[PDB]
Amino acid sequence: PKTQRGIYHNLKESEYVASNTDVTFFFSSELYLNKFLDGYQEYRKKFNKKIERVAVTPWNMDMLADITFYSEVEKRGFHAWLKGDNATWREVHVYALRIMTKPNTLDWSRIQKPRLRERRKSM
Amino acid sequence: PKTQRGIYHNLKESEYVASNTDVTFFFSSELYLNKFLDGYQEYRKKFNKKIERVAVTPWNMDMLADITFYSEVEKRGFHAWLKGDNATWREVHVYALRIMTKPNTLDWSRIQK
DNA sequence: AAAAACGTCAACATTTTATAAAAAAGTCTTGCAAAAAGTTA
DNA sequence: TAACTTTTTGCAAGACTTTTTTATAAAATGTTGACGTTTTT
């Protein structure tokens, strides 16, 4: 896959990947991968403000900020893994609920492309 | 306990009570009790509209809207029960967290001690 | 040894970001007049 | 309860402050088609 300019319209096959150790996001372009890795920390700051003006809760909404940021940056789709398995949007959001009870936040990082095994395994 | 005018600065011993069968909110004055019962269904719209601008999610945040609203209406304190037991502010939220994954919303209604 | 097939890479076509400026929605005072609560005897 | 005083409430008119739009240039991504090479015969 991967067009002449470097875009993967079929996320599963991408080589642009990011993972926070729990969740893995695939992107269609390096442009998006870096857009995501470069500004997610900022996005979290700005995310928490907006939300605090709507409600005050004992929760760490960072992961939720990360999915929203992901969704806003990847214009060509949505494909993610949750600890190795194929994860849907709702499934990543469930993880985000369970994890917002935790005070600290895992950071993100680029990681090499999975590998046919890990891929067939995730489904 | 109750002022002459009928205000309970000690919500723990108030007769102005609203409940949704799962949790129960104690008000300090019938006025606040009704400001709540009369304005919550509308707050849920306003609330989800507001939250929806920050992020779209598969969740039903009404209860969180409910807890938030309670906090802004009851100006003389915060007291609540969760399935019979006294509930800290954090425990009511934990609960609001669970019901987030439930499609329908419990409605509120006045009750008596 | 070519003709057909490929693969690379300018050069021009389109689609997407990035922003600055403007518009518009939404918030946060300030000021009483009114309703609620506190006091008073 | 009644009568009076002091707080909260409700709203309206401005002054501000984010969000949403627009518009437009910049930056990406997409396409096309000579031009050398490769591989098929």
Side-chain angles (χ1 to χ4, degrees):
Chain A
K2 178 178 172 191
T3 68
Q4 187 178 318
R5 284 273 185 200
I7 279 51
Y8 289 90
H9 292 267
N10 221 277
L11 280 40
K12 302 178 294 190
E13 312 194 3
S14 176
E15 58 174 298
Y16 309 115
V17 227
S19 181
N20 78 328
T21 255
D22 271 342
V23 175
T24 290
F25 289 145
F26 294 74
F27 301 79
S28 50
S29 72
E30 194 168 322
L31 182 77
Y32 292 162
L33 175 55
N34 295 318
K35 199 174 300 303
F36 175 87
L37 296 169
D38 287 356
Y40 82 81
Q41 276 163 147
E42 178 173 7
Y43 193 83
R44 284 173 177 173
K45 263 175 295 181
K46 166 183 292 180
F47 189 90
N48 241 65
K49 283 183 180 180
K50 293 179 186 298
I51 289 293
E52 290 187 358
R53 309 214 222 79
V54 178
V56 174
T57 78
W59 309 139
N60 177 184
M61 316 260 268
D62 288 319
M63 186 49 198
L64 175 52
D66 298 1
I67 355 193
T68 303
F69 197 32
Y70 177 55
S71 294
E72 290 196 74
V73 170
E74 181 45 59
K75 297 309 188 311
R76 305 174 238 248
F78 178 105
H79 187 67
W81 282 7
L82 188 46
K83 289 146 179 183
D85 297 313
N86 229 110
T88 67
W89 180 73
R90 172 172 267 259
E91 296 182 273
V92 180
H93 269 283
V94 163
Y95 159 80
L97 248 50
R98 288 185 56 276
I99 239 180
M100 57 167 72
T101 65
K102 305 309 194 299
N104 298 139
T105 315
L106 297 173
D107 285 349
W108 289 79
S109 177
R110 177 168 196 175
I111 67 169
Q112 65 187 71
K113 180 175 185 171
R115 256 214 39 169
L116 263 293
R117 292 179 181 176
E118 300 180 0
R119 289 178 54 179
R120 292 179 181 176
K121 200 170 177 177
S122 64
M123 303 167 255
Chain B
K2 177 180 175 297
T3 64
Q4 208 200 74
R5 297 301 184 180
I7 263 45
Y8 296 74
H9 286 284
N10 181 77
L11 277 33
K12 182 184 294 176
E13 68 198 315
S14 178
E15 58 169 297
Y16 302 138
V17 174
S19 174
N20 78 156
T21 82
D22 264 314
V23 296
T24 307
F25 284 154
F26 292 81
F27 298 69
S28 66
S29 69
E30 200 178 310
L31 200 215
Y32 292 164
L33 179 276
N34 287 315
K35 209 165 188 171
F36 176 78
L37 280 175
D38 297 304
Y40 81 86
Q41 284 162 300
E42 181 184 5
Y43 199 69
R44 309 219 267 220
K45 299 185 187 182
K46 194 183 178 181
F47 194 92
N48 291 72
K49 172 187 65 179
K50 209 169 291 300
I51 283 277
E52 241 209 289
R53 298 187 193 187
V54 185
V56 161
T57 57
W59 319 125
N60 168 207
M61 318 219 148
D62 297 338
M63 180 57 176
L64 181 50
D66 291 354
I67 309 187
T68 306
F69 197 46
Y70 173 54
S71 299
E72 298 181 60
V73 169
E74 183 39 75
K75 305 185 176 175
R76 287 181 260 264
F78 179 112
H79 191 63
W81 284 13
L82 175 49
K83 284 184 179 181
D85 295 355
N86 292 303
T88 80
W89 177 77
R90 184 183 211 285
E91 294 179 300
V92 187
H93 266 82
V94 158
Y95 167 82
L97 238 250
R98 313 277 175 175
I99 79 89
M100 297 219 112
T101 70
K102 292 292 162 296
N104 67 143
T105 307
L106 301 177
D107 280 5
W108 293 83
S109 62
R110 177 172 189 171
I111 62 176
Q112 188 158 176
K113 299 186 70 296

